Design an enzyme around this catalytic site. Structure first.
Site, PDB file in Angstrom:
ATOM      1  N   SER A 203       0.844  -1.203   0.000  1.00 50.54           N
ATOM      2  CA  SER A 203       0.000   0.000   0.000  1.00 50.54           C
ATOM      3  C   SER A 203       0.891   1.270   0.000  1.00 50.54           C
ATOM      4  O   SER A 203       1.747   1.403  -0.887  1.00 50.54           O
ATOM      5  CB  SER A 203      -0.955  -0.036   1.194  1.00 50.54           C
ATOM      6  OG  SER A 203      -2.126   0.667   0.892  1.00 50.54           O
ATOM      7  N   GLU A 329      -8.525  -5.359  -4.666  1.00 50.69           N
ATOM      8  CA  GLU A 329      -7.928  -4.140  -4.172  1.00 50.69           C
ATOM      9  C   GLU A 329      -8.940  -3.099  -3.648  1.00 50.69           C
ATOM     10  O   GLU A 329      -8.682  -2.436  -2.660  1.00 50.69           O
ATOM     11  CB  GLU A 329      -7.045  -3.516  -5.255  1.00 50.69           C
ATOM     12  CG  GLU A 329      -5.800  -4.285  -5.601  1.00 50.69           C
ATOM     13  CD  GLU A 329      -4.796  -4.359  -4.462  1.00 50.69           C
ATOM     14  OE1 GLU A 329      -4.928  -3.565  -3.494  1.00 50.69           O
ATOM     15  OE2 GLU A 329      -3.869  -5.206  -4.539  1.00 50.69           O
ATOM     16  N   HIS A 442      -7.559  -5.469   0.292  1.00 53.03           N
ATOM     17  CA  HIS A 442      -6.299  -4.735   0.393  1.00 53.03           C
ATOM     18  C   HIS A 442      -5.615  -5.085   1.718  1.00 53.03           C
ATOM     19  O   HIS A 442      -6.224  -4.946   2.798  1.00 53.03           O
ATOM     20  CB  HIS A 442      -6.643  -3.237   0.363  1.00 53.03           C
ATOM     21  CG  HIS A 442      -5.492  -2.338   0.060  1.00 53.03           C
ATOM     22  ND1 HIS A 442      -4.772  -2.410  -1.121  1.00 53.03           N
ATOM     23  CD2 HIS A 442      -4.976  -1.293   0.753  1.00 53.03           C
ATOM     24  CE1 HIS A 442      -3.840  -1.473  -1.120  1.00 53.03           C
ATOM     25  NE2 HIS A 442      -3.949  -0.778   0.000  1.00 53.03           N
TER      26      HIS A 442
HETATM   27  N1  LIG Z   1     -15.609   6.051   9.316  1.00 55.17           N
HETATM   28  C1  LIG Z   1     -15.040   6.648   8.202  1.00 55.17           C
HETATM   29  C2  LIG Z   1     -15.805   6.874   7.026  1.00 55.17           C
HETATM   30  C3  LIG Z   1     -15.229   7.486   5.938  1.00 55.17           C
HETATM   31  C4  LIG Z   1     -13.859   7.922   5.899  1.00 55.17           C
HETATM   32  C5  LIG Z   1     -13.083   7.701   7.113  1.00 55.17           C
HETATM   33  C6  LIG Z   1     -13.719   7.061   8.233  1.00 55.17           C
HETATM   34  C7  LIG Z   1     -11.660   7.708   7.050  1.00 55.17           C
HETATM   35  C8  LIG Z   1     -10.853   7.473   8.285  1.00 55.17           C
HETATM   36  C9  LIG Z   1     -10.356   8.594   8.978  1.00 55.17           C
HETATM   37  C10 LIG Z   1      -9.609   8.356  10.153  1.00 55.17           C
HETATM   38  C11 LIG Z   1      -9.365   7.045  10.610  1.00 55.17           C
HETATM   39  C12 LIG Z   1      -9.873   5.925   9.906  1.00 55.17           C
HETATM   40  C13 LIG Z   1     -10.609   6.146   8.738  1.00 55.17           C
HETATM   41  N2  LIG Z   1     -11.061   7.902   5.856  1.00 55.17           N
HETATM   42  C14 LIG Z   1      -9.577   7.868   5.831  1.00 55.17           C
HETATM   43  C15 LIG Z   1      -8.962   6.691   5.059  1.00 55.17           C
HETATM   44  C16 LIG Z   1      -9.769   5.389   5.157  1.00 55.17           C
HETATM   45  C17 LIG Z   1      -9.137   4.321   4.287  1.00 55.17           C
HETATM   46  C18 LIG Z   1      -9.445   2.982   4.929  1.00 55.17           C
HETATM   47  C19 LIG Z   1      -8.598   1.845   4.382  1.00 55.17           C
HETATM   48  C20 LIG Z   1      -7.139   2.047   4.616  1.00 55.17           C
HETATM   49  C21 LIG Z   1      -6.189   1.966   3.619  1.00 55.17           C
HETATM   50  N3  LIG Z   1      -4.956   2.171   4.048  1.00 55.17           N
HETATM   51  N4  LIG Z   1      -5.101   2.397   5.318  1.00 55.17           N
HETATM   52  N5  LIG Z   1      -6.358   2.330   5.690  1.00 55.17           N
HETATM   53  C22 LIG Z   1      -6.831   2.517   7.068  1.00 55.17           C
HETATM   54  C23 LIG Z   1      -7.229   1.212   7.761  1.00 55.17           C
HETATM   55  N6  LIG Z   1      -6.158   0.191   7.750  1.00 55.17           N
HETATM   56  C24 LIG Z   1      -6.151  -0.830   6.788  1.00 55.17           C
HETATM   57  C25 LIG Z   1      -4.868  -1.173   6.248  1.00 55.17           C
HETATM   58  C26 LIG Z   1      -4.811  -2.189   5.225  1.00 55.17           C
HETATM   59  N7  LIG Z   1      -5.923  -2.839   4.788  1.00 55.17           N
HETATM   60  C27 LIG Z   1      -7.131  -2.534   5.289  1.00 55.17           C
HETATM   61  C28 LIG Z   1      -8.212  -3.415   4.911  1.00 55.17           C
HETATM   62  C29 LIG Z   1      -9.429  -3.312   5.558  1.00 55.17           C
HETATM   63  C30 LIG Z   1      -9.625  -2.322   6.594  1.00 55.17           C
HETATM   64  C31 LIG Z   1      -8.606  -1.472   6.967  1.00 55.17           C
HETATM   65  C32 LIG Z   1      -7.305  -1.529   6.310  1.00 55.17           C
HETATM   66  C33 LIG Z   1      -3.562  -2.471   4.531  1.00 55.17           C
HETATM   67  C34 LIG Z   1      -2.527  -1.570   4.660  1.00 55.17           C
HETATM   68  C35 LIG Z   1      -2.459  -0.807   5.875  1.00 55.17           C
HETATM   69  C36 LIG Z   1      -3.625  -0.486   6.565  1.00 55.17           C
HETATM   70  C37 LIG Z   1     -11.710   8.156   4.627  1.00 55.17           C
HETATM   71  C38 LIG Z   1     -11.005   8.700   3.499  1.00 55.17           C
HETATM   72  C39 LIG Z   1     -11.651   9.150   2.342  1.00 55.17           C
HETATM   73  N8  LIG Z   1     -10.899   9.631   1.280  1.00 55.17           N
HETATM   74  C40 LIG Z   1     -13.091   9.088   2.320  1.00 55.17           C
HETATM   75  C41 LIG Z   1     -13.811   8.586   3.400  1.00 55.17           C
HETATM   76  C42 LIG Z   1     -13.153   8.129   4.619  1.00 55.17           C
END
Ligand SMILES: Nc1ccc2c(c1)c(-c1ccccc1)[n+](CCCCCCc1cnnn1CCNc1c3c(nc4ccccc14)CCCC3)c1cc(N)ccc21
Ligand SMILES: *[C@@H]1O[C@H](CO[C@@H]2O[C@@H](C)[C@@H](O)[C@@H](O)[C@@H]2O)[C@@H](O)[C@H](O)[C@H]1NC(C)=O
EC number: 3.1.1.7
Length: 536
Positions: A203, A329, A442
């Site tokens: 990632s 992904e 992912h």
């Molecule tokens: N409740 C909400 C609703 C909408 C938005 C929110 C939160 C958040 C958010 C903010 C703070 C903390 C957590 C999330 N984000 C920020 C980014 C969210 C991306 C989530 C997936 C991701 C991708 N890379 N890191 N992460 C964070 C979670 N860690 C994961 C990781 C990995 N894979 C996964 C797979 C499933 C769930 C989580 C996850 C792999 C790599 C590292 C981290 C968004 C970003 C946006 N552009 C739009 C909506 C949302």
């Protein structure tokens, strides 16, 4: 000294360290956890490039994971393993620049190839101490020296007022580079080979590995690279100088900081860390998926030009890379605010929800561009079908953000000198807590690459244990030789290089390696060759 285990005393440039003998299923490994590699980036050092760790006296205790870098804690589904396993497992602090080393026990007698892991998490989160990055299995089973480092994320890592002295940008990348330097100087003390260092990451970790490939000072610090489900090119991994300035200035306004760069940053430096985290998400230009507020910036320094310009004109003769993607992904991103989607139901969506989803997934797109995406992804035989629409929404996110940027990367590198191997990882962990519709999400190949299923207490299947062994063998063969194939082995099907001419890549699942051809070639022509032109 001198009760206490003699195989766990090591001197690095900064002084003496005491490690800890840990248990792996097959036998013991050495771990040196929480070694500091930089002066704590606190107070007047917030947003500043890292300074090397000043030496200490006495024995530093390196028996436990150290602090995690300040970050936003995910609370989408509280208590749910699927989200919780990515959340910080040590307390949050700005004093967080520590790395970890795992080596066989006793430490290897001859210089061993080194793997350095760079975690992902959108450049706003992640920690090298999470369970899925435990280096004990690669260390014990493959005899690898494995290193992983904390680097600053979010604003602390990436807030930039480009051109300024106090907030130059990319300091999180600079943290990672400092840890690479620390490996060159010190890793031999552990029996690692500084002349054989492989970077690997997933990632944003993958995009980081990529940025090190494209940045001159970094190139003399490693030899080979693995990019899992991420790339330095593409829509999310970087931002222009202008756009980063815009976001930094807005965040400053939002926390009460009003008016040249020195004043603005000085005021930011007096804001509680949590305050910055609390406002971090408010600076994005559009409602969007797979976009992150503070990411590497194109500063003309760490990055002399856009990743795209750099992959298209760089000479990659000397480089070996393994790159690849997981089957699904996009699916995980949809439950983060795409209306219609959830982990608790089948997320069968409507045609209206799919168009609304596309505007969000491709935020930079005009009306025309968005219609192009929708038309391309419609199943014209069942265009109202909610199962297909749900899978399409997923593929739009996954293809635009990972798969096609990966395809473009593999293509440019191969065309310009590199030996490139490519994979699609297709196995859903039997222990996965996400619903079936998400497929292989992912991040869910990591636990396999690091050999977690070899832990009997974890409840993976026997075939899954054998599978992780294969994968660990491919990754470490690649680290050792630049070629994932076993040199001695004859019975096992060969993994061919990826080329422009043949576009070969492999399936990674429970069945033996199958060679496939063309990495979503047709669709990636839409995203890489057509869509850019349409955006004008
Ligand atoms: N409740 C909400 C609703 C909408 C938005 C929110 C939160 C958040 C958010 C903010 C703070 C903390 C957590 C999330 N984000 C920020 C980014 C969210 C991306 C989530 C997936 C991701 C991708 N890379 N890191 N992460 C964070 C979670 N860690 C994961 C990781 C990995 N894979 C996964 C797979 C499933 C769930 C989580 C996850 C792999 C790599 C590292 C981290 C968004 C970003 C946006 N552009 C739009 C909506 C949302
Ligand atoms: C599926 O779920 C989405 C999110 O809603 C949450 O989960 C469901 C099961 C409800 O109990 C609700 O109260 C929760 O907040 C919904 O937005 C979506 O409409 C649902 N779709 C279908 C087809 O049922």
């Amino acid at each position: 000294e001198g009760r206490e285990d003699p195989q766990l005393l090591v001197r690095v440039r900064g002084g003496q360290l005491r490690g800890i003998r840990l248990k792996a299923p097959g036998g013991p490994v050495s771990a040196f956890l929480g070694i500091p590699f930089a002066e704590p980036p606190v107070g007047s050092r917030r947003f500043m490039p890292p300074e090397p760790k000043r030496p200490w006296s006495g024995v530093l205790d390196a028996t436990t994971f150290q602090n995690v870098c300040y970050q936003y804690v995910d609370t989408l589904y509280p208590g749910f393993e699927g989200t919780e396993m990515w959340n910080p497992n040590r307390e949050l602090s700005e004093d967080c620049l520590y790395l970890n080393v795992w080596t066989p026990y006793p430490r290897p007698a001859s210089p061993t190839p080194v793997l350095i892991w760079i975690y992902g998490g959108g450049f706003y989160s992640g920690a090298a101490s999470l369970d899925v990055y435990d280096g004990r299995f690669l260390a014990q089973v493959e005899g690898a020296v494995l290193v992983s480092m904390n680097y600053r994320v979010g604003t602390f890592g990436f807030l930039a007022l480009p051109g300024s002295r106090e907030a130059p940008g990319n300091v999180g990348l600079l943290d990672q580079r400092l840890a690479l330097q620390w490996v060159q100087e010190n890793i031999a003390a552990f029996g690692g080979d500084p002349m054989s260092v492989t970077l690997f990451g997933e990632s944003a970790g993958a995009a980081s590995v990529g940025m090190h490939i494209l940045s001159l000072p970094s190139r003399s610090l490693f030899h080979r690279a693995v990019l899992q489900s991420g790339t330095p090119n593409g829509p999310w991994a970087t931002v222009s100088a202008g756009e980063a300035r815009r976001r930094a200035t807005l965040l400053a306004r939002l926390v009460g900081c009003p008016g040249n760069d020195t004043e603005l940053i000085a005021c930011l430096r007096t804001r509680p860390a949590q305050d910055l985290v609390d406002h971090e998400w408010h600076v994005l230009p559009q409602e969007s998926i797979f976009r992150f507020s503070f990411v590497p910036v194109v500063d003309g320094d760490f990055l002399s030009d856009t990743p795209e310009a750099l992959i298209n004109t760089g000479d990659f003769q000397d480089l070996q890379v393994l790159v690849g993607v997981v089957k699904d992904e996009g699916s995980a991103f949809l439950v983060y605010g795409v209306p219609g989607f959830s982990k608790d139901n089948e997320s069968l969506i409507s045609r209206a929800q799919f168009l609304a989803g596309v505007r969000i997934g491709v935020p930079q797109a005009s009306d025309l561009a968005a219609e192009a995406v929708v038309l391309h992804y419609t199943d014209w035989l069942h265009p109202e079908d909610p199962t297909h629409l749900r899978d399409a929404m997923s593929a739009v996110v996954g293809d635009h953000n990972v798969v096609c940027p990966v395809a473009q990367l593999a293509g440019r590198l191969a065309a310009q000198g590199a030996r490139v191997y490519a994979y699609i990882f297709e196995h859903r962990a039997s222990t996965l807590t996400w619903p079936l519709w998400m497929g292989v999400p992912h991040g869910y190949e990591i636990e396999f690459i690091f050999g977690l299923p070899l832990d009997p207490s974890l409840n993976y299947t026997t075939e899954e244990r054998i599978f992780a062994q294969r994968l660990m063998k491919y990754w470490t063969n690649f680290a050792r030789t630049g070629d994932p194939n076993d040199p001695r082995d004859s019975k096992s099907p060969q993994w061919p290089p990826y080329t422009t001419a043949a576009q070969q890549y492999v399936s990674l699942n429970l069945k033996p390696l199958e060679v496939r051809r063309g990495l979503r070639a047709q669709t990636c022509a839409f995203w890489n060759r057509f869509l850019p032109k349409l955006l004008s």
